[PDB]
Amino acid sequence: VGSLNCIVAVSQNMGIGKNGDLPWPPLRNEFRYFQRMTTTSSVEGKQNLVIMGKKTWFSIPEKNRPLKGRINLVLSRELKEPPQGAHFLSRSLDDALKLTEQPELANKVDMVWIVGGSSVYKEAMNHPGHLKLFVTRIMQDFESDTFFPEIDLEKYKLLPEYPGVLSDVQEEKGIKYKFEVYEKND
Ligand SMILES: NC(=O)C1=CN([C@@H]2O[C@H](COP(=O)(O)OP(=O)(O)OC[C@H]3O[C@@H](n4cnc5c(N)ncnc54)[C@H](OP(=O)(O)O)[C@@H]3O)[C@@H](O)[C@H]2O)C=CC1
Numbered sequence: 001v002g003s004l005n006c007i008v009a010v011s012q013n014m015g016i017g018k019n020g021d022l023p024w025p026p027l028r029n030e031f032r033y034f035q036r037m038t039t040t041s042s043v044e045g046k047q048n049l050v051i052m053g054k055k056t057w058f059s060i061p062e063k064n065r066p067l068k069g070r071i072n073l074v075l076s077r078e079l080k081e082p083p084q085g086a087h088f089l090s091r092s093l094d095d096a097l098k099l100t101e102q103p104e105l106a107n108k109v110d111m112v113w114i115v116g117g118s119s120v121y122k123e124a125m126n127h128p129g130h131l132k133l134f135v136t137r138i139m140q141d142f143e144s145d146t147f148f149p150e151i152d153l154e155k156y157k158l159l160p161e162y163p164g165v166l167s168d169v170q171e172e173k174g175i176k177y178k179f180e181v182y183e184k185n186d
Pocket residue numbers: 007008009010015016017018019020021022052053054055056057059075076077078079090091092093115116117118119120123146
């Protein structure tokens with residue numbers, strides 16, 4: 001088990017979701033960025049683990065579940081078994097991380113990526129240890145019903161650059177955004 005990372009795309013009004021969908025129209029390269037960041041393992045024979053909440057899970061198009069090339073884990077207290085397509089389910093982020101140490105996952109998992117939503121993000125951000133936040137700042141306001149918790153700038157440092165990540169402004173569909181990487185080690 002390697003790094004603990006969160007990854008999120010967030011609007012200017014701190015929005016991340018709207019009606020079980022993204023607040024903004026599809027941004028192809030933001031998507032490609034998400035896919036390549038979450039899928040790419042730094043170790044041969046190992047896959048990355050994606051941890052998501054139930055709503056995030058069901059917001060993903062059925063034909064794209066589970067997230068290809070990655071081990072999918074769903075967080076929920078109501079579900080009695082992993083949803084169709086998933087094989088792992090945990091009552092909390094802490095339980096999931098503890099699960100990553102058991103033999104069934106211990107030697108198969110490289111990086112751990114939290115991919116939403118709000119309360120998963122919260123729990124992760126407040127979790128102790130080396131944590132990295134990959135935050136796409138979408139430089140525009142969008143109507144949202146789900147929100148990204150504010151980053152404690154007394155715990156986190158904003159990195160000026162991160163390896164493999166471009167720090168310049170991106171633009172698709174008339175929408176400008178930027179890749180940021182925050183870090184804490186406690
Ligand atoms: N822009 C972005 O980077 C992303 C956007 N989104 C968007 O956000 C919306 C979904 O996010 P959101 O509304 O926050 O929903 P979530 O994905 O967080 O799902 C909420 C449910 O997940 C379970 N859950 C969540 N957090 C925890 C936790 N910490 N411990 C245990 N269980 C937990 C609970 O289920 P239960 O009731 O069973 O206990 C809860 O009811 C979608 O519209 C999606 O498109 C999502 C991720 C990323």
